[PDB]
């Protein structure tokens, strides 16, 4: 539950564990140190992690920084700097310092040799992360990637567009993604462990024979999610509703409020661009007004590209859910995606399961090239 | 004034001017007093801006603010202020602070609202500003914008581009500029207004008459430039191209190597390949710094194309320091529109002698102008 | 915030190097909206502008603790007891010293800690029926006996006023002398000037923290008060509970010595372990070991996880761990007189994490005073509320 | 040579190179690997101090420190680092980083180790280095290595203080330390190289065989002293004047102004009441930019003592390159010992022509001595 936690200083810091290790590393580059053997310092801060990974309530990871997650892992971040070190060269600098982009390029890789005992559910955030904003799947070179991991785990879809139970609007979301399954994981037996969820936890979807995609019972898995009052996601859209109209009123911009059934957000018309700020705006708009009516139900508002919306799903539940359902525990579950700050829907997965953080979908395939490579 | 700012805290921190004002607005945005009328906080930093204009390095605001940038022009800091928060009503926000990028947008008005007393020359960055990067001017609003401000002052498009003195190969770049030039601009007299600089300061064109660019020779404005013999500019080009074939060999990558007369560049190639945004940085510096050990005083500039690198023997601001010595016009009334304001770009230099808008895209260009035309 | 309980918890526990970086939140808070209103040059004009909204949300906070924006500005926000008048507060000090005049030094940290210090004074206009004072560093120099007839007066006179009393950390067993031999000139101004009067039964002392307590006789005498008549509002330890805190303890500071050398001793008692150093032929331990012990301390007794009340604290030359609290002595006393929170006050010089005094903010209003020059212009602002 | 200017930023950080040092061991205390083998750090650091010491115009440690000084000797970081760890253990903290004043130890302690070539010339602050504020010298086992090192090299006494050149006034303040001369130092010659200069650089004092002092000739030494005349000394004295005039009244100091020749300061009136560090360093910058202003160009100095200000027509780094002309003593050669080597402080001058000793109390400074005598 990190309805509450919403500080400031936990907004306009990018994010502690990355930060953490980039002011270590700018130390480190000033003192004309950096391109000799770091180990002493690369080993003890790898310890200090796996202290934190058996005692994170107490470990001095946790005196350093407050705020940090969750480790589900041994993170070798001593193997992740020198395999990516010794592709990039960043050491070799003498007046650039590392970057917080690079470092979470180090973070996001020793995630990935932490998985040296397995991985079994894997889980994409479709948009931004497979394809542009809104754009369909037409990258033909990473569906092999996924049509190769499918045969030895399962692949998952979760993303926040929401289309109420209706499988086949997804197909053309996906059409050539299924279409590569029809090439290769038919005649396999891999193809029933690929999963679609709609909403953020509200709609799943399996996969067929015929390489389609079709709704699945609700009877299935109406008692691992945590059910909910009728009532109460009526209440919650009729806040923010109520909210946006305020934020559209308080800053006259050109857009307007589209409702649905346990999701709503605005989405500016015909598009003008709404400035990234007023949307960060929004959502602590919202979410202080959830938290001053003493909600508690599962909810996500999220600040992705240019649109805001507002699920009464969670990312994270919707990984709860498969973990439950396909008998998968947290530490051989991973998840890749973009919204992964404080105003994003895909920081909640950091307390279910392992996550990389992805900029634009081409890192995805240098995530998933990486993690066959063992 | 050779660039000698080659400093960790140029590179590590922003723009000390417009971190200034954001921090002082945090400050205003936590009191909860921002949306109050706040402008006692407002006419301070306002008598702290007069002061720099008179005594630039013996203000409070040099004691405060260091490296701090030279003011030709008394800025309204006030009015900016005002008319921009009535458009886009920042100030009532309650949890998000005043960001980087609007105060540099209030600053640009600020700038623009400085100019009562007359703008008399305009230069535009070519690439990144008037169409993206490695593109053809494809544009009718912004050309519409510029034919009417042709008429009230001189116009001129300083750029980095360089092609060794082809006027055909530089019309091909704007097609569709000199297209609405020839329908509006022809039977007055702006279209001996209007000017090209190629290269950095290297290659000068003008507009002839019939709806075509031409390049002017080089005898009638090269005792202008600096006299930088054809030894000295092929040095800096060798001790470039010998720093980035280290660059090529330091990170593995699939760059080639541009030559040409005045200039040195690095350019990856398809199989674009993205050169990390960082190297360039790194290169940028190890060539400035290579240049300073051998005692080198020609105006020259490294700067990072944003996916590529080039090193010309060209400096824009002696561009327009150039145009400022032909047309007999002071540096008050002279103002730049670039994208590369930072330390490692090329637009920079333009702040120690015209009045400088920073843009991002050329949709705030276009912005820019119709702000800057209701005067 | 909750009960007593839970604060403690957090407190000892729920540390941050970010936070034990900058000594206050609150008054950092002050300190980055003044160096930007001095950066600005705004500062000497008329700022009620600015100081009116910092009021607003102060307000704000007094009646909602959990979900304002100051809680969302400064995450760890002490509960405010009072409505803070910090545009008068702001006002009066500067009217005196003029530190906005200045042009090319910012505001400091100890002048905002000032300015909040009277802002809570100024906050007393419902009454005070209760002050308390940390005894060493602020009534007397640290180790030193009672010896300041300017401040003998003032508190005589607010006696007859309200009720006072003195939680320190010196802890003797039960020897009334040995604490009459530190304050015998207080006592003895209130012989004088107080006996008159009914309020010298109104005058108590708490030894150590929350473990010693003692009234004030009609023969100017202290004497040890029953346990029969305050036992119960105090949160019971286990003799073997204490011992283990006591030895937990005592294993560390034995650590410390082999790390560092210090030419220092541990001094042992029931419900009490310190580290003082050695004589001459005193020598110094270094601030930051002290800091560092007590961080070593308070890591190693959650580990072993024990959840009594206990307060390790740094002494400016020593290191001493009670079993008990500033804030359970401030309990045990409002329990006793009945006296609402709102009407009491604390004076001490250790309000920093790892300090004396800090658990005080939990449960009364607090001034954060440096030395007893500092603790008469307190008192001699608390004489002219009326 | 010049005293330089300054920035708000440059007033916070007391010290850039120990606060750039201050940072990487934070990160490394923050990095769990503060206990372990750090050579592999320590060594590149000094790798940046020798790299700075060769080429001081050019070097990384210029880079990354703007405000660097001139290494006049190689600085052995490292083994001062292991020499101060093993003492304190400052290593073995877990909770808490290393602090400024311990670099500060550790940069005073590499400055000594640094003199492995020898000393010429050793110089103290008298006020604050050698007693209290005020008073008269009182310390037999800070006397016996005054003394002691009096046999070895040249001893100089360069303190702001003025007694109107009469040595009768200066004894009182050394009255303890002489006496032990006459013991120890008068059956050689040691005491002929005992100095001691009243103010920054206009008074100076030599020994005589009866343990006394002496005001040497002016026309000795007269001639090093950049000559400054009474036209101008009024003027800074005057411009001064009027700085603490409105000092006073801006605060309502209680406070009086004391004017002599060549020198004013600010001083509270007897009661000693207490007078605001914050408005001392306010006076500083106020008369600072005030004489700038003036377009002032004598060496003079204006630092915040204790309890008092004062402006002074010279300052001691002056007054060292008089001593350096007058006994002939290379810069390399020379050390200095004072408490306020802050940018308000009369001792911070003296890097730009000597090595340094930075201290707070007398204890400190006998620590010192006993870790130069022991090498
Ligand atoms: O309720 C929904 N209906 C339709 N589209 C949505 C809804 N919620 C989010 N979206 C959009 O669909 C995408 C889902 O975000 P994701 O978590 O990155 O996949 C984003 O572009 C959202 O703006
Ligand atoms: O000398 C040149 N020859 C060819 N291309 C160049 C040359 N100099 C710069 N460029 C490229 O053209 C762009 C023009 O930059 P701009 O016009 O300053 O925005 C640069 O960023 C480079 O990509
Ligand atoms: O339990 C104790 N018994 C005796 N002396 C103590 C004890 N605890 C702390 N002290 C010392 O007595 C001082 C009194 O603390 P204070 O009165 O809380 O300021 C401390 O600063 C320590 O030097
Ligand atoms: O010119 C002066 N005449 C008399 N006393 C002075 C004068 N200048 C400074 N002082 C005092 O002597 C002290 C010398 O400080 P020092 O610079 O550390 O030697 C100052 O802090 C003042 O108290
Ligand atoms: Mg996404
Ligand atoms: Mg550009
Ligand atoms: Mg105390
Ligand atoms: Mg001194």
Wanted: hydrophobic share 35%; net charge positive; glycine share 4%.
């Amino acid at each position: 539950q990190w309805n509450s936690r919403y500080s400031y200083n936990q907004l306009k810091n990018k994010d502690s564990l990355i930060m953490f290790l980039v002011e270590i590393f700018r130390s480190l580059f000033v003192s004309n140190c950096i391109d000799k053997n770091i180990d002493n310092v690369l080993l003890s801060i790898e310890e200090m992690f796996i202290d934190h990974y058996y005692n994170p309530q107490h470990s001095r990871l946790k005196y350093l920084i407050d705020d940090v997650g969750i480790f589900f892992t041994k993170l070798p971040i001593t193997k992740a700097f020198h395999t990516y070190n010794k592709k990039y060269r960043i050491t070799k600098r003498l007046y650039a310092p590392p970057t917080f982009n690079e470092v979470r390029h180090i973070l996001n890789l020793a995630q990935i040799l932490s998985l040296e005992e397995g991985l079994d559910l894997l889980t994409f955030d479709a948009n931004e992360t497979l394809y542009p904003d809104g754009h369909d799947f037409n990258d033909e070179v990473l569906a092999s990637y996924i049509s190769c991991l499918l045969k030895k785990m399962n692949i998952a879809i979760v993303t926040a567009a929401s289309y109420n139970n209706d499988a086949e609007k997804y197909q053309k979301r996906l059409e050539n993604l299924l279409k590569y399954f029809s090439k290769h994981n038919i005649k396999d037996g891999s193809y029933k462990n690929f999963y679609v969820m709609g909403g953020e936890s509200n709609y799943l979807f399996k996969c067929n024979e015929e390489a389609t995609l079709y709704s699945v019972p609700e009877n299935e898995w109406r008692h691992y999610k945590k059910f909910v009052d009728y009532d109460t996601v009526q209440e919650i859209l009729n806040i923010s509703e109520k909210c946006l109209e305020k934020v559209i009123k308080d800053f006259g911009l050109c857009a307007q409020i589209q409702r649905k059934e346990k999701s709503i957000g605005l989405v500016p018309n015909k598009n003008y661009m709404i400035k990234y700020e007023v949307l960060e705006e929004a959502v602590i708009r919202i979410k202080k007004e959830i938290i001053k009516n003493k909600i508690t139900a599962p909810y996500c508002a999220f600040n992705g590209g240019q649109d805001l919306w507002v699920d009464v799903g969670n990312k994270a539940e919707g990984l709860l859910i498969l973990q439950k359902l396909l008998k998968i525990q947290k530490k051989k579950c991973c998840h890749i995606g973009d919204q992964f700050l404080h105003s994003g829907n895909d920081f909640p997965t950091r307390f279910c399961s392992l996550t990389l953080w992805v900029s634009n979908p081409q890192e995805t395939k240098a995530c998933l090239k990486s993690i066959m490579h063992l």
